[PDB]
């Protein structure tokens, strides 16, 4: 089994009160069966779009999740991933400063 | 030089439950999608049909439609043939397509992976195992190579159909393939590590370096190329510095879309 | 590439155990079991890719398969039913598409073995009138009073089987069509040249291979046990 | 029922030709095979067609296959008596052992034999062991004659049967009649049948 790598990042430069798109990039995992959620304040965001699953030259799988979001001084954003390779679900928080 | 890739992924949970999904790339742009749920291959670009006529495409799709059903039953039957040596769950991946070179030159490939390891390819006129493959696969390979009709089809598919089809794709989608999208940069800091964010650029080639005046910082570590939804790219370059030394640092970004005027961003 | 089946013909009872064996010496990995029923094509029951491996076919219910070795594929009927009355074909093959078929196995499953009876075989000597009128001599064989209809009539001249000049009824007729489990009768002809019949050194024999009970089947009646057997009638040629 | 054969059954006179149709919906279609099966006997392969537009031959047997139309024919030239058999169409969905065979229910062929020189007669034949018991043999009649079962249920009559004396190129129809019931004779054996006017009744 390959343990998945999660990376959370914004499409445009993050500015409070301005609508934007948040991306979650899940990579280097096998088998391909995976669960990806995008969380706002720990709650599941309703409209999360998924790109088709594909794989790299090294046969490892990748997939891009993304959703519209408005960043604020208060709100927290996360990407939660459940995969067979992990006993407990992995949560990577969005950091404006990265 | 453009690589055309047909990436198939197949999962076999048990003797009955199975699914096959395919995506298709020309360079780093998706041209096709084929979900298990769909009876037909989907165009993800307006020019995904290439220079093939509707008749030619229907004949081509129909062959894949037969392949998907046939492939599924074949694997299931080969698991029965090897048992109890090999058992579900089983993951099979195919990487098929061709790479285009200047002139009339091309090079086709068809690589097969089993449980995440590359084991089988089509080469020349037959299936063969690659170095490192387990010996038990010799029976499946002998069985697949008995099927002369499949061999002739795959030969024609790799030698003739792929390069022909991709030459057509490169004409039909010239605009998209040669598109130039401007990068946008912004700076940030974590507890100290400085981060230069570059996002929204196409194509992939990009140059990002932290600058102290006119001197390139050696410590600059570039991260991986991360994709955006709108088929543009994202990349961040980090620099580890001692607190207080923030003043005088800048981020210079070179990209084919900016046309000389590099993005300069002072901290 | 040849394939053999045993038995070639079987009469069995409901609830009985029937084993159909198939042997191939071609070193083929793969073996298959089919059944043929009038108004249908051959249908796959079980198959095998190698020793120790058995796979369900299209109609596997009521049947169990066994592959102890590369040479033997075996179709086992644990609790025989009348619905399993069929002609059973076996096949083998290597990695290629060709399946090589066996000669078939005729099976009949009866509700009760109560009425099973071997035939009486009589041979009838050619007419003197026929000899003078045609210069040909027709022998007639008659199998009578047998049940069920699973018989194989064959002609033998000097310990060797003959097919030339032979005609056997395509189906046996019923002796008492009014009765429920009627006994059958079967007829056959062997026509030879008059001079060949007139030869006193030629031994003519009509052989009926009857299929009935096995030595293991329970028999609760006073009459002789109607086992699988050969009954034959015989005559020498004469001037 | 992905393999359909036509006609279901057919009757031809010796020397005549016949065409047998096989239409299928099997997917994919690697090869098509024609079997010949005699009543009782097993499956004898006649020809296998493999190409997109294929044609084969095997003596008096020829065949075609059109994979686009999903259709095959088997032509038999100058039918002989030995052609009397069920003819089975089979479609394999792979070019390997991974394939399944899809069988048609068959086409029943009956070739009516040419009787060159009819010489209809009814002879009496005697039992080797018990000479007082006997049978009646109606023989040497042509294909036009039908043999009917007797009105008396004690009398048994078989349906006609054509034998081939191969080394002499001779063919002849025959039927057998018997009954142990008192006052049974060969002259009165075939009364219920329309037998030819010049039928020989010896002695
Ligand atoms: C690659 C060039 C592409 C250029 C065209 C561009 C099109 C873009 C559109 C996107 C396409 C959709 C995405 C699909 C990506 C997957 C790429 C797969 C390419 C390979 C296709 C193989 C086609 C071969 C023909 C077929 S069906 N064979 C099938 C039918 O064949 C029957 O019918 C035929 C005619 O219909 C013949 O009569 C034949 O004799 C008979 O047996 C036959 O069943 C094949 O066996 C299928 C399997 C092939 C893959 C096996 C390799 C994997 C090995 C597995 C390891 C073993 C594991 C052990 C547990
Ligand atoms: C497709 O191209 C391959 C080469 O990749 C051809 O394979 C060669 O075939 C010849 C005989 O046909 C063999 O002697 C060679 O060994 C093969 N070459 C290699 C490098 O393996 C193949 O013939 C071509 N087929 C078609 C239909 O065009
Ligand atoms: C096979 O696997 C699927 C998905 O993992 C599961 O839902 C299903 O219950 C399994 N099927 C059988 C017949 O066990
Ligand atoms: C994938 O497609 C096949 C045929 O279209 C279907 O039978 C199968 O159930 C599908 N798999 C899943 C997991 O839905």
UniProtKB/TrEMBL annotation, chain D:
Keyword Cytoplasm: no
Primary location class: membrane
GO cellular component: T cell receptor complex
Intrachain S-S bonds: 22-89
Alphabetic keyword roster: Adaptive immunity, Cell membrane, Disulfide bond, Glycoprotein, Immunity, Membrane, Signal, T cell receptor
Ig-like domain boundaries: 1-92
Lineage: superkingdom: Eukaryota
GO biological process, one term: response to bacterium
Protein localization: Cell membrane
Oligomer and partners: Alpha-beta TR is a heterodimer composed of an alpha and beta chain; disulfide-linked. The alpha-beta TR is associated with the transmembrane signaling CD3 coreceptor proteins to form the TR-CD3 (TcR or TCR). The assembly of alpha-beta TR heterodimers with CD3 occurs in the endoplasmic reticulum where a single alpha-beta TR heterodimer associates with one CD3D-CD3E heterodimer, one CD3G-CD3E heterodimer and one CD247 homodimer forming a stable octameric structure. CD3D-CD3E and CD3G-CD3E heterodimers preferentially associate with TR alpha and TR beta chains, respectively.
Name the record gives this protein: T cell receptor alpha variable 11
Source organism of this protein record: Mus musculus
Lineage of producing organism: Eukaryota, Metazoa, Chordata, Craniata, Vertebrata
Residues of the full protein shown: 23 to 114 of 114
